[PDB]
């Protein structure tokens, strides 16, 4: 009985990811982060 909490972790995975990427890489193309996060789209890679 915890599934409604589990389903909203996709916001926290991607904020953990964007902190990891911005701390690792300094000058990274926005059309490279999406292929690494398997976002399938660079047009919202600006948007996150």
């Amino acid at each position: 009985g915890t599934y409604t909490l589990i389903i909203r972790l996709r916001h926290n995975v991607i904020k953990t990811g964007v902190r990891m990427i911005s701390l690792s890489y300094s000058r990274i193309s926005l059309a490279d982060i999406a292929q690494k996060l398997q976002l399938d789209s660079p047009e919202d890679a600006e948007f996150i």
């Binding site: 389903i7 916001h11 991607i14 919202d44 948007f47």
Partner: protein
């Protein structure tokens, strides 16, 4: 069987001289029986299955006339009807499209706490089944992260009913959001790139946004006033607050408590 209603309820009578009789019809419901959930007499359902069908359609034309305070009046009463453990219809062709409709408009009410407390009432109906309710919960999930295009791909995908007044508030609360998030550290943008980030081709609506906030109208330019310079070099704000805190250390250090 005391109905007085079965002639002009399905056909559109938009804000005509029926709703005054209709509420007076609902007033005459109250003289017969209360809308107490009628714990006894389970077989008699004409006060329950025939009377709630009036109250769910009475919620339905509330949104076509843009009647916001009386809209949640009927919808809260329907919520107090499916709380009954007495066996009813489990649903109809309306229950998903009304309960999840409340989910979609309370989204527009900008109250996320009540958005997630509905989720007790249907554990399995969110992902693995009930696809018409999977669409609103996936929508606000996409509003949670930065995703904006997939939000409007769901504005290319409205399957269930019209949902028109809801997504237009969802238009409006995104319009100021991008007009909010145009104010990040951006460079010169011409009058095509951030002109098409919302929807618009080239109306004067961009001048409404470019004169509301900055990013000044120039020679095909959005001017960046990316300053963020004024606030630092503050010793005083610690020097007021820490001088309070250091005394608080000496309070629970020497004097007996």
């Amino acid at each position: 069987m005391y109905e007085q209603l079965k002639g002009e309820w399905n056909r559109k009578s938009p804000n005509l001289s029926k709703c005054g009789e209709e509420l007076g019809r609902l007033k005459l419901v109250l003289l017969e029986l209360n809308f107490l959930p009628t714990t006894g007499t389970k077989l008699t359902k004409q006060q329950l299955i025939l009377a709630r069908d009036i109250l769910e359609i009475g919620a339905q034309w509330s949104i076509l006339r843009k009647d916001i305070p009386s809209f949640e009046r009927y919808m809260a009463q329907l919520k107090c009807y499916y709380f009954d453990y007495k066996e009813q219809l489990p649903e109809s062709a309306y229950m998903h499209q009304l309960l999840g409709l409340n989910l979609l408009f309370l989204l527009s009410q900008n109250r996320v706490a009540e958005f997630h407390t509905e989720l007790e009432r249907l554990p399995a109906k969110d992902i693995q089944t009930n696809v018409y309710i999977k669409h609103p919960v996936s929508l606000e999930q996409y509003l949670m992260e930065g995703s904006y295009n997939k939000v409007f791909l769901a504005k290319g995908n409205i399957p269930a009913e019209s949902y028109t007044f809801f997504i237009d508030i969802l238009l409006d609360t995104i319009r100021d959001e991008i007009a909010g998030c145009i104010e990040k550290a951006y460079e010169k943008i011409l009058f095509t790139e951030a002109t098409r980030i919302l929807f618009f081709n080239t109306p004067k609506k961009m001048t409404d946004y470019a004169k509301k906030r900055g990013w000044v109208l120039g020679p095909n330019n959005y001017y960046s006033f990316a300053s963020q310079q004024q606030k630092p070099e503050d010793t005083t704000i610690p020097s007021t607050e820490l001088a309070k805190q250091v005394i608080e250390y000496a309070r629970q250090l020497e004097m007996i408590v």
